[PDB]
């Protein structure tokens, strides 16, 4: 059973604003003991954000952001959320959630990561969309 991190809630908020992520592991599929959340840019590697594991606390966050971004594991409909409140104008990129196991190191392995779901902060502006 590999980690196939379905995400989801990828859009455009203004800066200040709050976007919640929600990653849907295979419909509903557990083999993750360790996970993430990473940042991803055009000519930018994806860097730490957050990280959730099988219990223990799993809780990250920048001091930038500090509080605001906060970050759930349920598995029991196998979904992991990162609830971003107040995003800043240059968190205009692609986000991706992160999967694996522990290693007996004691280090942390992202084995697998996200499809990449595109979130744009708008300075303080929106866009409409007719069909």
């Known amino acids: 059973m590999q980690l196939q991190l379905v995400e989801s809630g990828g859009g455009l908020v203004q800066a200040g604003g709050s976007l919640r992520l929600s990653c849907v592991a295979s419909?509903?599929?557990?083999?993750?003991?360790?996970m993430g959340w990473f940042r991803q840019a055009p000519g930018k590697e994806r860097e730490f954000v957050a990280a959730?594991?099988?219990?223990?606390?799993?809780?990250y966050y920048a001091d930038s952001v500090k509080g605001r971004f906060t970050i759930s594991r349920d598995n029991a409909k196998n979904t992991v959320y990162l609830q971003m409140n107040s995003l800043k104008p240059e968190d205009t990129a692609v986000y991706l959630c992160?999967?694996?196991?522990?290693?007996?190191?004691?280090?942390?392995?992202?084995?697998?990561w996200g499809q990449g779901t595109q979130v744009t902060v708008s300075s303080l502006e929106h866009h409409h969309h007719h069909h």
């Open positions: 419909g509903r599929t557990f083999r993750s003991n360790a």
């Open positions: 992160a999967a694996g196991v522990w290693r007996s190191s004691g280090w942390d392995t992202p084995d697998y």
């Open positions: 959730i594991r099988w219990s223990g606390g799993s809780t």
